[PDB]
Design a protein around this ligand. Structure first.
Ligand code: GLU
Ligand code: GLU
Ligand code: GLU
Ligand code: GLU
Lengths: 254, 248, 254, 248
């Protein structure tokens, strides 16, 4: 019954590995699939997980058109977007969100051992290239900012958009590992990467503070039910357990 | 024009100190008044600040009846609750909230140098009394919990006719200072209090994670308008500045 | 039989909480205490845990005299030092160390939300006080450094009868929470603190890279044996489990 | 004077490319050769570099005899071993090691674009082959491991004896490049290899944590001197510069 739009993004949504045959929903796994399971059992709904065709989170182009999971909701093509979808004021204008299931902030993924310590440092040089995932909320934060440092950074990433803006986080990560590039990435995803790719680290602190919410078309009769369910899972300690399960690891030596 | 219900709690809402007599909204100062001033400018509304008459945040009795700021919104005696009001699943069933303007978790406030290291420490002893603000979300978190350790804690704090609970955070801070008592208090508040009193400290880390949001009655058109304005204030760095200003 | 010198330092060595009578080794708990049981079982020795009387890790004063746990090993007053004792070149000239049981680097503990991004930022000002634990290896790092940013930091933390230095980590943490002060602290301790004290954070990356080792006096019959045991425990995954056990926690929202 | 045993391994020990022929020590370049030069100047000694004849790191045979670089030291055939030689307890019982000059952990080197994410993914199946460098610490780690996942992986990589265990890292790399195969390799090497070959990637995180040390024969008159030198080189930011240099 319910159509769920989502996007590949480790460890939130990933393709499951099995020698066995996977049917529909079982093709996927991750933090967001476990959350989506909880939600369907608590609220009593059936659902069909569909990956967003353009593989984008969602941004409004200059024409005024949206793409990504946000457009799927606006156009009523999906009933819910269950993904690390960031809650922002530009999106609240066109779709609804549940209270957040996880908090995060934009920060920087880069290599260890360099003199770079802040966005300010990146803004003050051009040797190191830097950017964010195209049509993501990080890119939009930079595009719409009136703060000097971030305007200068947007001017830089914008002029190089074809190299600076990446298709997705996986591409951004490979770019940091193999070229002199820093990715503007959400903190939770940075935490995940840096406990595996031990030559990478977070640079500086968090640039902002926000959260991931389940998206719904404006006025959906599931928004509040979902908000209530998430808030209750939080209070029962089940979201912490989910987080530990997907982020758990041996880490890296210092 | 808009009727705003609120509650006294430092540094969110405090009586402005002055020689001459202050009237109306001018009697109040704090992080939430700055936030409210920002929202009124952005949104273009006038407002009137009224302290909730029963002095409570809001909980439901076993009869199904609410009190505090929550009941003011439910009963349509206020348009907005602009206070350090926690977003909880029990309150979402009766009122609406904007997305959070601040994040926090339940933690423990106690005097320094003692024995206690965490809520588990507290749950297995009775020498140190412990409690929470009556009819606040912290109290309700323990009351509704199915986690054995929190169930044990709720049993201890609700017996003896709830003598372990306090009427408000100030009565809680004074009790922590005058006797062997630990207050289950929200982290943002503990961070303010422990900067102001070197006798006090936070024990353990956070028990949970949640947010404060502006409360409105269900279906209010201001719900989303305020969500957008708060989210923009966050993104422009304005909320961070307000926090710095009030947390010293 | 064996005398083990140690020092209180959360969560490595702490007094156990108990309304009952606690004697001998049972009076203590913590990561180092679990390490110590493993070692006593693997090597088969009996032991008595004894806090270092001066309560210091150990440094050599301008007069030339060692103090702390280091001095206890030199004077054959302790058979082992089991604690978060940093392996350093100055110490290695006077005592022996097992291979590292844990890695770490010096970094900065300060409050969240400021413009300070690195040691460089602190070295160029005076309004923000900064320092380290007196007579520990981080103090000796700044005292012995020939790197100019660090030489400038030593000059500061070292002035006015060393007012910027603290007696222990606890006092340093309080000073950070209650005054405009930044503590130079090892990364493993910062991790523990910042996961409980949500308004505090690590500033910049790691200044250096080192490890903690079990210390013994030069010529110790248990020297190589202890080293074999640590390496094996590491290989068997036991040290990772001990770390997860003592650092486990809920974390802070973003 | 001093005979230093080593083994070719990028980017620690490699042959310098030159138009004119190169002789003796000048035939080699790399992180480990730079470390050796620094040790030479700190301690004041002359040395000669001789790749270990068998080209192996070290592993004690199914009897009790040692091969490769470990062997060389045991038999006093080499004064030192300056190479990416892993500090392990098995080796600790027959040779001395300095304190580590570099940290790392076993991880997986595979091809990109697959649902394979960890060692658990490799272990629970058998279509994709996986192995390690015959007679290195990685092999020995799986061999001596009592951890269920790793014993099962050693079961597989041993019954697949020939095909699964490779001669050296180059052969392993090649096998990953031209076959459905995942090589178990130390993280520092995978970091190097992957920067220089975009079709290769690290799979999952680190299996363990350990270090590389300069090896010497039991009770060598240079043990303590080398340890102190390496510790001082780190503290003066020099081992860090050598790392940035060879890994770009
Ligand atoms: N969570 C982001 C995607 C990642 C990013 O923008 O950095 C979004 O919802 O657009
Ligand atoms: N913020 C709480 C009040 C304080 C507390 O309960 O700790 C509430 O909304 O009820
Ligand atoms: N671990 C240090 C003490 C703490 C510090 O110096 O930061 C030592 O062995 O001296
Ligand atoms: N560094 C390893 C060789 C490479 C490996 O075993 O993965 C050793 O000393 O044995």
């Amino acid at each position: 019954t319910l159509i769920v739009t989502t996007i590949l993004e480790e460890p939130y949504v990933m393709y499951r590995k099995s020698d066995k045959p996977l049917y529909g929903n079982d093709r996927f796994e991750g933090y967001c699939l476990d959350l989506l399971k909880e939600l369907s059992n608590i609220l009593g709904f059936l659902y069909d997980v569909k990956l967003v065709p353009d593989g984008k989170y969602g941004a409004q182009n200059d024409k005024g058109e949206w793409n990504g999971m946000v457009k799927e909701l606006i156009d009523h093509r999906a009933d819910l977007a269950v993904a690390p979808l960031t809650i922002t004021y530009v999106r609240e204008k066109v779709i609804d969100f549940s209270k957040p299931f996880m908090t995060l902030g934009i920060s920087i993924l880069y290599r260890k051992g360099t003199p770079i310590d802040s966005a300010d440092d990146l803004a003050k040089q051009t040797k190191i290239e830097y950017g964010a995932v195209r049509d993501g909320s990080t890119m939009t934060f930079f595009k719409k900012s009136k703060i000097s440092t971030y305007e200068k950074m947007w001017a830089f990433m914008s002029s190089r958009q074809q190299s600076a803006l990446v298709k997705n986080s996986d591409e951004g990560i490979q770019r940091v590992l193999t070229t002199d590039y820093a990715l503007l990435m959400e903190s939770t995803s940075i935490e995940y990467v840096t406990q595996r790719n031990c030559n990478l680290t977070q640079i500086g602190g968090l640039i902002d503070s926000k959260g991931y919410g389940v998206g719904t078309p404006i006025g959906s009769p599931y928004r509040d039910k979902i908000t209530i369910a998430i808030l209750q899972l939080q209070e029962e300690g089940k979201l912490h357990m989910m987080k530990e399960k997907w982020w758990r690891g041996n880490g890296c030596p210092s």
